[PDB]
Structures are given as structure tokens and as C-alpha cells.
Amino acid sequence: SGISLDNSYKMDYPEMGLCIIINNKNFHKSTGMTSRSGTDVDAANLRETFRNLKYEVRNKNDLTREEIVELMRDVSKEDHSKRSSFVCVLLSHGEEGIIFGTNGPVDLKKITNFFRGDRCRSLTGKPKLFIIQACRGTELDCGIET
Amino acid sequence: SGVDDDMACHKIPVEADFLYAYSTAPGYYSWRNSKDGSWFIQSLCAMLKQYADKLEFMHILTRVNRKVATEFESFSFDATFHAKKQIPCIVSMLTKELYFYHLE
């Protein structure tokens, strides 16, 4: 054939892929973490947005730290051969490098490591997108007038 | 030649092909409105709805950065938390351009 370029990911597999949305709104009383009012609007907006991009959206609400890890492990062990990409959206409280389950923290590296190129073969070479609504510390940006 | 290029057996990094679309810069709070949702997710959805059939993903996320940065500012009865701003943070380990659409 004619000249070929390889500058964009192949996005015409049979399926665009999964979009896993973890929507943590209510936290166990013993943690003292306040409920995240407004997060259901985000989870609904994301579901609609990714549905129109033809992702298979799976919404999960109020998962413990153990459930988050188990969900990620199980998803990483599916056969993604016929999927172009993978998306995970995390909506929770957080700190730098950490997202909260309803009963305590999960290191973001633990979640993303399941999808490493050597650990999720059917996603090797395919874009893996993690969208994270959570704090990354306690600094405040005062802004500057333009 | 050289010792560290032109390998006979091709590998890629195990950390390649990841993209982390963080709602805020490292070290910072991330803001959420109790009625409308988080500033970042509101803006990300709006830009994907408008531009996913038109722009490469990094360029969509750059519009999300501009929308969050310019259109939102916190309102709080607590002066400590009032009038604050936010910039999201795109962290790309991707190796190719990403378009949500393809040629038919």
C-alpha cells in the first residue's frame, strides 16, 4: 500500500473499552469523612459522556478499600483483546498519591499497577486513562487577577 | 553504533501508555460544588461532549484546563477557603495521539 504513519492509537477495535466509574459519596462513620455532595451529578454526567463515546460504562458506588482493589484486579484480569482502550474514573476524597475507599485509603499505584504493560497483556500498547477527582494535598491557589 | 539503542527484541516500558487526568495540581485541594458537581468533572464532560469528534485528547484536556482555570472560583463563608482557584494537571505517559473517533 501507500505510505503509512503510526502516530495515533488504533481506536477501531470492536469495542472502545470499559469505563469504570468509582463514585464514593458516603463514607463509614468511623472514618469521620464527610459525604461528598454533588458527586452523583459527576457520576451521571460521566456515564452519559462516555456512553456517547461508546464506552461500556460500569458504575460502582461507595466501595471500601478492599472492594476497590478487588474490582481493579478483576477488571485487569478480563480479556480486553477486542477493546481499544481502558478508562477508570475515581471520585472520592484523596491526598497526594491516594484515593479513599469508604473505610480508608488506597494507594493509586496499587490500582494502576494492575494495568501495567506486563500485568494486563490484553491492554499492552493500548491507552489506559485514569481520571481522578480528589484532592492531592492541602495547598490553596489564591489566583492572580488578569 | 551504541549499546542502548537498536535492540533485537523490542520492549516497551511497563509504565507506558498511561494517562492520568488529575483534577488539580500536585499538593492542592480540588473543588466540588454540592449542586453542580466537581469543577473538573463538569468541565471534562462539557469539553468531551463538544470536542471528542474533533480534537486529539490532549487538546481536549487543555481546553478543560482553561475552563477550570478561568471559569471557577470558590465561594465560602470561611475566609480561609474563599476566592480560591484551581488548575487541573494532565500527566501523560502516552506514546501516540488519541482520538475517540476513527475513519469509517
Binding site: - | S23, S30, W31, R32, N33, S34, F81
Partner: peptide, 5 residues
């Protein structure tokens, strides 16, 4: 109302 995460 505004809160943070």
C-alpha cells in the same frame, strides 16, 4: 455550596 475533596 463549595467544598473540597
Amino acid at each position: 455550596x463549595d467544598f473540597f475533596x
